[model samples]
Target: MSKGEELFTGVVPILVELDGDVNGHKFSVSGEGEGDATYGKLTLKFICTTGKLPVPWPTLVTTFLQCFARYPDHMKQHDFFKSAMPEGYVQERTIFFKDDGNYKTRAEVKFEGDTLVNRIELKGIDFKEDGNILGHKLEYNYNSHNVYIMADKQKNGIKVNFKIRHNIEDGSVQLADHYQQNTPIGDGPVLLPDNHYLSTQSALSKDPNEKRDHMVLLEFVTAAGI
Candidate 1:
């Protein structure tokens, strides 16, 4: 209800298990980061010690949790992505037709060569209204965080880049090879990213500001455990 702030230097174990048809994998990506939250905004930055280089997918998940450390509404506003607004906030995934002389744009999150990558392609148009024909194709890493453009409005324009660190002031964390180790796991309510636009109903049904913190965390974990 009031303006609040917190700076936490802490560590938490990361346990991830993956199962496939012909094989299985267990990963122990143990690491920690600083969490700063104020006025319902949070930023988390962390590093991994088990290896020298950054681990993309695992690091992305941890960084997301820090965003979740804030309130739900904030999470909806400040998602991990910086390019476009959340899904519902915009129209349905717009797929422009090639025959109409419109641009072709696409964004994807996938794994390539042991790293998680976000790639974007925009081409076949000279300009767009209120936005660029091309945006950022962002990649995640523990050591860097940035957006790179490959192509814009020009035919066959494509760019690739990755971000391993947060750049937001007043709420940014740094990732690295090794940091001052474990500070003990703490407990608190964090933000939750609801990609499906399902949390709104639950949040609206609740009494205003009644156990709102607990409700936020509960809804998040119930929908997304980690």
Candidate 2:
């Protein structure tokens, strides 16, 4: 994996769609994840794009995705953010995180070129919770974060389970749900922000229809890359 020790950029597309009354409303959550297995820090990242993708709720979903990503104090250099970005584009975003057990912190993030100016600091609100967790508030304060965080909690490990949906009619996709193992992160896995933790937001209220239960199911991607 020695691509000059660069992070294996895992882009988990956060898709969206409305049920019962909707089928055409589609968009995505572009999850850019990186981390130091040694530092025990897995820094998930996202650069808000100029164009929108398939989804009903963009900002809310983006914020929900933002909740899980935390950049440590040392990882806040302009050069550091430059490498992870796939291209040169202007981006704005909101990020939630836990910094070394501290409750609140802020970080500056900007794009390449088009910038002979100062950078911007997106407010990063931090907090720890009881029983369940708000995905972003917990610190990735362990060693081998990449390996262990993805482990099973059955043995006291931590991880993330993305509940997904596939639409055959329109061939669209939806990231119907999100959980940072607290609902459970470990290898049983291992640990949430909401009272009901409904970060898996819904959209497309144009055509109101009947409401149903949680029609989500467990799923996975294969041969897409590790």
Candidate 3:
């Protein structure tokens, strides 16, 4: 296979429309973190591969190191997988967003216990521009199938408004333990506060045989305001 084609072999791209932007919106997801040594250790990343334009949208911006993971579970302990377990992996926790704002941004994650961090420094595609940029950090619970995300984004000189919703009964994703709330990580979280609201149908697994893997609908719809 071609190199570019091989790079995104198992990636699933979701298409959505952002408010006030004519550009086509989509994000790619991989079952595994490819092109890096931090494979299984790295979980999932939502990449805005296209749709962020400048003429009507924003400048050409990209992220080379935008992956999340948990410690001792994926980072240190491997579940006998050949590569890093990508998103949708069971027993995964500690979701994070590495390298925020710039290509040279640092790698950091909020964990619960036994933290051994590493700095993934690499040169990514950088450009010169005077536009306002923003990013969002995500927290996905493996057992619950509930994802909590907070946005601290901006475009031009104004704050951007957006909303997100996920589908948990789509068969591709599942809510193993419904009607249960799973606690998240951290004090000084990445972009937003560690404490936030989750959907009513959020899952939680207090037992072992209650794990599930299904494609949930993380629909990014629009709102009147933020």
Candidate 4:
């Protein structure tokens, strides 16, 4: 098979309203650091690709990179299977958002009848939190986050259409354990503080885990690879 083609590149539009401009919404553009790389990543993609997109939502238009991957964890890292395939193994997370990178997600392709299409549909579920070793629990709250992957019909690009659909924003926290917390090389949706991700098992198994093991109300999500 051929390599993954470059689909689109540029800042992303957010909170589009019927009568308003697409980016006339949320984004805090005033920060002390460089904003370019903060919103997205450029990677060597095959079927599974990863990248960043800065949100240019108006008024509060600050640059924040959103890390998104469109590949599933199947024959990954295997050169043999690299010969061909397309699977949407989705995981949503952001670099700056601590404990906000909800790892578990589901993406299904669309079928319009006698043929299949490139439209992708997915959502973030089983939202999680980084517990305090200090507390080891929380009543984490979340709302409906649905993502629609569609071709920029009029343009030669792909659009990551986002919205909080049908349901109201629920504030009720769902208590959970290790499984619901951060996963290494961690990523997610909102801004983070002390609850950032471990990046990898090795890093987690190092000083972070060591110190985490002592105190601070945070803990490991799974095996800290050595």
Best by lDDT: 2
Ranking by lDDT: 2, 1, 3, 4
Better-scoring candidate (lDDT), 3 or 4: 3
Report the candidate with higher lDDT, 1 versus 4.
Answer: 1
> Which regions of candidate 1 deviate over 4 angstroms?
1-25, 40-43, 52-55, 62-138, 141-226
Per residue, candidate 2 scores C-alpha lDDT tens digits across 1-226 of 1111133133223322211111232222232333332232223332224233222232132222222133233332211122323221122322222121111111122222322111222222222232012222211111111211233325332234343332222332322232343111111211211111112222222113423211121111111112
100, model 4: CA deviation in Å? 27
Kindly list the per-residue Cα lDDT of model 4 for residues 1-226, writing each as its tens digit: 1221122123212111111111222111111111111222222101111111111011011111122221222311211111111221122222121233222222222222312122222222222223221122322212323233332224322333232111112433422111211111212121111111212110001124332111111111110111
Off by over 4 Å in 3: 1-34, 39-52, 55-226
Ranking by TM-score: 1, 4, 2, 3
Cα lDDT tens digits, model 3, 124-208, are: 2322232122221122332222233223223101111112222222323211111111111322212222222222122211223
Report lDDT (CA) for all predictions.
0.23, 0.24, 0.21, 0.20
Compute the lDDT for candidate 2.
0.24
lDDT of 3 at 63: 16
In model 1, which range of ten residues has the least summed lDDT? 83-92
Candidate 1 lDDT, 1-226, residue by residue in tens: 1111111112222221221110111122222222222222222222222332212232223212221133343433323221121110111112232222232333342223322222333233432222211221113212322222222223211222223242222344432221110111112222222232111101112125433111111112111111
